[PDB]
Amino acid sequence: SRIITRAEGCYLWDSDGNQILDGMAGLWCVNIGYGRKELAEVAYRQMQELPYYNNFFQCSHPPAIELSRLLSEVTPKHMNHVFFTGSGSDSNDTILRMVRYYWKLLGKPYKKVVISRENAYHGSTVAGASLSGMKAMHSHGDLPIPGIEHIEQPYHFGRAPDMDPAEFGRQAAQALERKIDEIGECNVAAFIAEPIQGAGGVIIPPDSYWPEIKRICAERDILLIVDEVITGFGRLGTWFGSQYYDLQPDLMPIAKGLSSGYMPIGGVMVSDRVAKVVIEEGGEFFHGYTYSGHPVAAAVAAENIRIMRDEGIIERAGAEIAPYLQARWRELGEHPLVGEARGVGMVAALELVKSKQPLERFEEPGKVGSLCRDLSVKNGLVMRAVGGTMIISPPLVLSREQVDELIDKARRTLDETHKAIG
């Protein structure tokens, strides 16, 4: 209902001339901010060079290879292969398809089960929507397809506000060992988790969770799938949310920040463990499946990544602005309407609550965040509402002046929300 005339930097100007700070990077994706001519230029060039090449006819300096090199260099040091695709949901299909195929080639075809988390988002294909724990998506059809289970999420504030933050961290990761010993270790092929859940609020694991979950992936013989669709490309202060939590994923769906949202593209990083098996000594994969991603989108994604490592914008993001934003978000932790002030790197969330000292949640808390979102825009700041959780995922080029806009506009938006409610 807003209608946007101009979009440049971290801003959205609206039809009536109102400047709106985009705290959401649109949809977690535009990391270098808007209005980058350098991406529109490389698109124009590649749409004229060759817009769709097959395997019998490659062009000269094809973008699939320019991109492949940059990503093997920017990604963790064990992941040095990539396969492309048309969005970030496609990525979770290929992972499902190939994680199972890895075990078949290792002689254990019974290993085909894939464990997820409740309130986890992994795509919207028929496989992304089954792996995703959003129980609302599962209504449409008998969606959770065979071989997909789901386990507890580490939402300390919403499940168990009183448990020791770190004892809960250990408990909710052992929820994985529980589901392993009920299904059968030899039936489980892998575990997939966002380093942080975007779509469910900014649900951040206690610092204990990921360590225990890595332990379990060793005692039991299973692959790790980290979904860097959102936490990828500077979103957690680091190139990939894996290196924030010292994970060694055996697969990673990527998208969004790959092209800063300027072009549909997704891919999957493939660790060297699983590459020796499915690529060498394996060609039934890539049968019909063809992973020479759309050349125009890989061309943009290449320039997108050059822009971020050469102008050091994600290195500056994690070193200079991420602290200030996180330190100052906590400041909103004292507003009477706010229960938790959550956040890591360049992403953050607020919990909206009826009273704090007894900490009672609202009956219908979505109606409360749904209002606060409508008043953040009406005060010049985009901020999503999952439930009564307010979230921001700003572009990575944000400047400290633009966080003090964000904080002061948030405080105003909370004060207005707090007056209406009582």
Subset of 288-307 contacting its own copies (CB under 8 A) = 288-291, 294, 296-297, 306
- CA dist 146 and 113 (Å) reads 8
Asked if 286 touches its own copies (CB under 8 A), the answer is: yes
Alpha helices in 184-279 (DSSP H): 209-219, 241-244, 272-278
Q: Which is nearer to its own copies, 216 or 313 (CB)?
A: 313
Question: By three-state DSSP, how is residue 19 classified?
Answer: strand
Give the binding-site size for its own copies (rule: CB under 8 A). Answer: 108
Q: Which position among 67, 79, 96, 349 is part of the footprint of its own copies (CB under 8 A)?
A: 96
Minimum distance of its own copies from residue 8's CB (angstroms): 7
Candidates 90, 152, 194, 227; binder of its own copies (CB under 8 A) is 90
Distance of closest approach, residue 211 Cβ to its own copies, in angstroms:
31
Per the rule left: phi > 0, alpha: psi between -120 and 50, beta: everything else, 26 is: left
Contact positions with its own copies (CB under 8 A) in 112-141: 112, 121, 124-127, 129, 132, 134, 136-137, 139-141
Among positions 97, 178, 276, 411, the unique one binding its own copies when judged by CB under 8 A = 97
- Selected from 72, 118, 145, 215, the binder of its own copies by CB under 8 A is 145
Q: Is 53 in the site for its own copies (CB under 8 A)?
A: yes
DSSP for 282-317, please give it.
--STTSS------HHHHHHHHHHHHHHHHTTHHHHI
Q: Which of 29, 79, 325, 398 binds its own copies (CB under 8 A)?
A: 29
Using an 8 Å Cβ cutoff, are 199 and 134 in contact? yes
218 binds its own copies (CB under 8 A): no
Residue 156 in tokens: 């300390």
> How many Cβ atoms from other residues are within 10 Å of residue 355's Cβ?
13
> How far is residue 326's CA from residue 394's CA, in Å, rounded to a whole number?
12
The CA distance from 349 to 201, in Å, is: 7
Tell which residue, 290, 302, 279, has the closest CA to residue 61: 302
Per residue, the 3-state secondary structure of 310-349, as one string, reads HCCHHHHHHHHHHHHHHHHHHHHCCCCCEEEEEEECCEEE
- Using the minimum distance from each CB to its own copies, give the nearer residue, 288 or 358: 288
Q: How many other C-beta atoms lie within 10 A of the C-beta of residue 61?
A: 10
In angstroms, what is the minimal distance from the CB of 145 to its own copies? Answer: 5
CA dist 360 and 339 (Å) reads 9
Scanning 10-18, 163-171, 243-251, 344-352 for contacts with its own copies by CB under 8 A, the matching segment is: 10-18
Residue 88 among known ligand-binding residues: yes
Q: Which of 10, 21, 30, 173 binds its own copies (CB under 8 A)?
A: 30
What whole-number distance in Å separates Cα of residue 209 and Cα of residue 199? 19
Least separation in angstroms between CB 415 and its own copies: 21
Q: Which is nearer to its own copies, 36 or 156 (CB)?
A: 36
Cβ count near 112 (within 10 Å): 18
Query: In this complex, which beta carbon is closest to its own copies, that of residue 99 or of residue 193?
Result: 99
Q: How far is the CB of 104 from its own copies (least distance, A)?
A: 7
In the complex, least distance from residue 417 CB atom to its own copies, rounded to whole angstroms = 17
DSSP H helical segments within 354-399, as ranges?
Answer: 366-377
Of 83-91, 163-171, 359-367, 410-418, the window that binds its own copies (rule: CB under 8 A) is 83-91
Site for its own copies in 306-325 (CB under 8 A): 306, 310-312
Q: What type of residue sits at position 169?
A: G
Residue 290 annotated as binding site: yes
Please tell me whether 89 is known to bind a ligand.
yes
In whole angstroms, give the CA distance from residue 187 to residue 108. Answer: 9
**Beta-carbon count within 10 A of 209 CB:** 24
Side-by-side strand order, sheet with 4-8: 4-8, 11-14, 19-21
Site for its own copies in 160-199 (CB under 8 A): 199
Give residues 243-282 in contact with its own copies (rule: CB under 8 A).
260-266
Q: By CB under 8 A, is residue 363 in contact with its own copies?
A: no
For its own copies, which residue of 10, 21, 23, 34 counts as binding (CB under 8 A)? 34
Q: Binding to its own copies (CB under 8 A): which residues in 372-391?
A: 373, 377, 382, 384
The binding site for pyridoxal 5'-phosphate comprises 88-89, 256, 290
The binding site comprises 88-89, 256, 290
